[PDB]
């Protein structure tokens, strides 16, 4: 009994990587995402990530193999704080609308001001238009 909300979240995650919508994630695609996020994995390191979950040996990740990676790859505290540090680029720590838009762009999402504000309304518990660390922790632990 998977829900369609769960399935949609899996789809959305798969699509981040599968830039060409062909249903297969390649080292090229995995690398594209990682570089836009500031990382610099080598081709060989990317291939080793794939090999780990590549059940049919074809060298690329398909949907159920991806679900396998997520099961395996997804320190509660240290993991939430490291993510916060990516969002709160200037370290003040409030995540501004401009900081959120920068992360979202790197996630291949081109957003306007209005849904940036919608995004912020998921976590913002004092209505200052920003997400601070406590609000960030709440958002990650809620329903």
């Amino acid at each position: 009994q998977l829900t369609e909300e769960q399935i949609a979240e899996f789809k959305e995650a798969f699509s981040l990587f599968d830039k060409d919508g062909d249903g297969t994630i390649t080292t090229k695609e995995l690398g594209t995402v990682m570089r836009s996020l500031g990382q610099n994995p080598t081709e060989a390191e990317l291939q080793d990530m794939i090999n780990e979950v590549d059940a049919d040996g074809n060298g690329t990740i398909d949907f159920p193999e991806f679900l396998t990676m997520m099961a395996r790859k997804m320190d509660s505290e240290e993991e939430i704080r490291e993510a916060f540090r990516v969002f709160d680029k200037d370290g003040n720590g409030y995540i501004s609308a401009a900081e959120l838009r920068h992360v979202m762009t790197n996630l291949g999402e081109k957003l306007t001001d209005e849904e940036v504000d919608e995004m912020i309304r998921e976590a913002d518990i004092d209505g200052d238009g920003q997400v601070n660390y406590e609000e960030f922790v709440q958002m990650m632990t809620a329903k």
Binding site: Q39, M74, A83, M119, E122
Partner: peptide, 16 residues
């Protein structure tokens, strides 16, 4: 989308 986006950042972080 916000919570889901954080998870996607964390995923790539774990991959590296």
């Amino acid at each position: 989308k916000y919570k889901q986006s954080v998870r996607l950042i964390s995923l790539c972080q774990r991959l590296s």
